[PDB]
Ligand binder design. Structure first.
Ligand SMILES: Nc1nc2c(ncn2[C@@H]2O[C@H](COP(=O)(O)OP(=O)(O)CP(=O)(O)O)[C@@H](O)[C@H]2O)c(=O)[nH]1
Ligand SMILES: [Cl-]
Ligand SMILES: [Mg+2]
Length: 723
């Protein structure tokens, strides 16, 4: 009934124009805590369908969510209908990029937590990703049936266990956002927490129990008596959870002004800032592109969040960084399960658009070319595992290049390196599963048979000392650049890594952040380029033509950051300082082909003078094992160059927290299973890049150079600079 496609078309299209009645939400959780069962049962309970959501063949075969999925529901609350745009997100750490992209589109998050496992490593990760986006969280504690049936827990004890979960989530919130904790605090008594069984279609909350005249003792009886279906009639999952969504997650009128504080360095008082804050359909277009996907019938689809304005077929918008207007072909919304085309979409909605040929993940699409773009969408960690990929058949060579480029466009937590001169392309990602799924879907969906090499790690290059000034010279000798280099301080690197500083911020705003983190006032005032992991500082004054030349100097800097001089691995942790410069007065002698090499070579040589070295990625590993198998678990992790960071005993089980190099964790799944007779449960989180041992530098570098087909000799500064 309510979910009839044409009755939902009319109901959604009516609600679409009423931002008060919209809720843009993501469902987020540690792996297997029940996101998709919840999403599926909300859709079913709400009438939108008759697990549906895991559409991909591999998601059903593996019982894992691989891609974010967009659906919507219409839900009545206090005699009014509301449009709930829902994004179900992957739990596995390898697909975390989908969580980060989903979080940019939504204003509220249902954090799902398993009552049995409690808060887990990615519970913290997704909560942090929500709070960094100014997304409001509520809590659904799931699998309460198991808590009741497998632990036979009494009304008072089950309560104590559920309360501990709530307190833990609140502690995480308070630690992440101390200044907004009071507003964000989860209170079971008002109803910001619900508890239930997504699998069995029931849920309760403290206020709902105090009104249904139902107690927790009755819930235990329903489960013990194998009458959970009768419980689902009295305490419907969709009614309790969707009510909580409407009552506690924000509409776009409430949320957009909060979202733009963190996703946009523009002025909230500018014309576009006010239109976005007011969710104005008659403002100019401001569209945040969060996802690129490929449709069988429609072609490429750009999904995103429309903050201001109205979109319709034929309307033209600029794409940030690109010169020409792109023309919308179709616009669509998610209506229950289905992405349906509509005549026009308005601010406040999550939208799907075709025709934006230049759009990428993170693009700003706008009516005015000059609009300040939204911030990039940055994932919590970067690629650490790589394989070589090659077509099995010479007729598929050009197609494989298009396929790999499209794969990385659709998931920028992958990094593709095309080689059209050998065909041995490189694919880097977050983990082995990440790359296994990509390879499978190339063969299945794109019909290109491929080989992949054994996985290897991706290192990072950095420096470990100060060097300079070092002079780089243009090929015509007319232009000179004098560079000093040193490692970033940890607190500064964190600001850069977290995007807390930006060249888009007011100079005063940015410099105060840097100085409070320990940077001197001249370096803070001189910062001119903040890359993803490195900074460039201009210490000069009065050098004529330098401002117009600085973009070329920074291009040379970016070229080095893509692959450092030790082994062509990505560079991180650099503070590069321009101390002096000499420029020819005529622009014909200081164009890109003159200035870019001069900047690049000075930085390359300075790195080799500054104790250049390699960093290797480490994972944090969390191993939950019964006491009987703790010896095998400890031995397995310590045999892989692992170090134990913590051991916590809870009952007759131990939670081991350890760290180990990614390069030492291949085959861990099978080895930890046999070492513990299948009893270990384990998860991971990326820890960071750490310095390789000093007496392994030459051999590590030579091995990388060998793998890449580079010169079999250690680089030296004279390879880059000459008299
Ligand atoms: N007993 C019980 N099992 C549940 C409940 N909710 C989900 N499950 C079970 O947990 C497993 C995972 O459920 P699923 O909904 O796919 O979780 P998910 O968090 O989406 C998995 P991913 O992180 O890969 O996306 C399934 O076997 C499912 O039936 C519940 O309320 N009770
Ligand atoms: Cl610094
Ligand atoms: Mg799922």
């Amino acid at each position: 009934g309510m979910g009839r496609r044409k009755k939902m078309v009319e109901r959604v299209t009516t609600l679409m124009d009423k931002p008060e009645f919209i809720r843009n939400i993501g469902i987020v959780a540690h792996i297997d805590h029940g996101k998709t069962t919840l999403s599926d049962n909300l859709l079913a309970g709400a009438g939108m369908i008759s697990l549906f959501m895991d559409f991909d063949e591999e998601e059903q075969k593996r019982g894992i969510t691989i891609d974010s999925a967009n659906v919507s529901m219409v839900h009545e609350y206090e005699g009014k209908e509301y449009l709930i745009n829902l994004i179900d997100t992957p739990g596995h750490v390898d697909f975390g990029g989908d969580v980060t992209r989903a979080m940019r589109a939504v204003d509220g998050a249902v954090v799902v937590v398993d009552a049995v496992e409690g808060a887990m490593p990615q519970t913290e990760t997704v909560l942090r990703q929500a709070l960094r986006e100014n997304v409001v969280p509520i809590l659904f504690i799931n699998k309460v049936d198991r808590l009741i049936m497998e632990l036979k827990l009494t009304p008072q004890d089950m309560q104590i266990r559920l309360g501990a979960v709530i307190d833990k989530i609140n502690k995480l919130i308070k630690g992440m956002k101390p200044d907004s904790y009071d507003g964000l605090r989860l209170d079971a008594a008002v109803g910001k927490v619900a508890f239930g069984s997504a699998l069995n279609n029931w849920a309760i909350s403290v206020p709902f129990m105090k009104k249904t005249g139902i107690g927790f003792k009755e819930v235990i009886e329903y489960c013990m008596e194998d009458q959970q279906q009768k419980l689902a009639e009295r305490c419907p999952l969709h009614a309790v959870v969707n009510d909580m969504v409407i009552r506690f997650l924000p509409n776009p009128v409430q949320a957009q002004k909060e979202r733009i504080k963190v996703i946009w360095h523009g002025d909230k008082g500018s014309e576009i800032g006010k239109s976005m804050a007011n969710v104005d359909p008659n403002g100019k277009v401001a569209l945040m592109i969060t996802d690129i996907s490929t449709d069988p019938h429609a072609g490429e689809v750009a999904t995103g969040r429309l903050f201001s304005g109205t979109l319709e077929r034929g309307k033209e918008v600029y794409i940030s960084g690109m010169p020409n207007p792109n023309r919308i072909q179709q616009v669509g919304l998610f209506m229950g399960p289905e992405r349906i085309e509509v005549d026009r979409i308005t601010a406040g909605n999550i939208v799907a658009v075709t025709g934006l040929a230049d759009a990428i993940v993170g693009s700003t699409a706008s009516t005015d070319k000059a609009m300040v773009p939204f911030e990039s969408i940055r994932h919590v960690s970067e690629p650490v595992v790589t394989v070589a990929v090659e077509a099995k058949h010479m007729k598929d060579l050009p197609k494989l290049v298009e396929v790999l480029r499209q794969v990385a466009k659709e998931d920028p937590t992958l990094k593709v390196t095309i080689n059209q001169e050998t065909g041995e392309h490189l694919l880097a990602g977050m983990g082995e599963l990440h790359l296994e799924i990509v390879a499978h879907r190339i063969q299945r969906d794109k019909h290109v048979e491929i080989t992949t090499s054994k996985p290897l790690v991706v290192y990072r290059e950095t420096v470990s000392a100060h060097a300079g000034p070092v002079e780089g010279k243009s090929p015509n000798r007319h232009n000179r650049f004098y560079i000093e280099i040193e490692p970033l301080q940890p607190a500064i690197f964190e600001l850069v890594r977290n995007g807390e500083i930006s060249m888009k911020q007011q100079e005063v705003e940015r410099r105060d952040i840097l100085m409070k983190a320990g940077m001197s006032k001249e370096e803070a005032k001189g910062i001119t380029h903040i890359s993803e992991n490195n900074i460039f500082i201009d210490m000069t004054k009065g050098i004529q033509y330098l401002n117009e030349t600085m973009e070329l100097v920074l291009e040379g800097f970016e070229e080095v950051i893509k692959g450092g001089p030790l082994s062509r691995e990505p560079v991180m942790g650099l503070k590069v300082k321009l101390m002096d410069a000499k420029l020819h007065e005529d622009s014909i002698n200081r164009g890109p082909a003159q200035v870019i090499p001069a900047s690049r070579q000075a930085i390359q040589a300075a790195m080799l003078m500054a104790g250049a070295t390699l960093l290797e990625p480490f994972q944090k590993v969390f191993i939950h094992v019964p006491q009987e198998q703790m010896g095998g678990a400890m031995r397995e992790i310590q045999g892989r160059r692992g170090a134990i960071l913590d051991m916590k005993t809870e009952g007759d089980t131990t939670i081991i927290e350890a760290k180990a190099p990614v390069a030492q964790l291949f085959g861990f799944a099978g080895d930890i299973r046999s070492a513990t007779e299948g009893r270990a449960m384990w998860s991971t989180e990326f820890l960071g890049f750490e310095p390789i041992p000093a007496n392994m530098l030459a051999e590590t570098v030579m091995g990388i150079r060998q793998r890449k087909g580079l010169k079999l000799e250690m680089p030296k500064p004279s390879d880059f600079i000459s008299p």
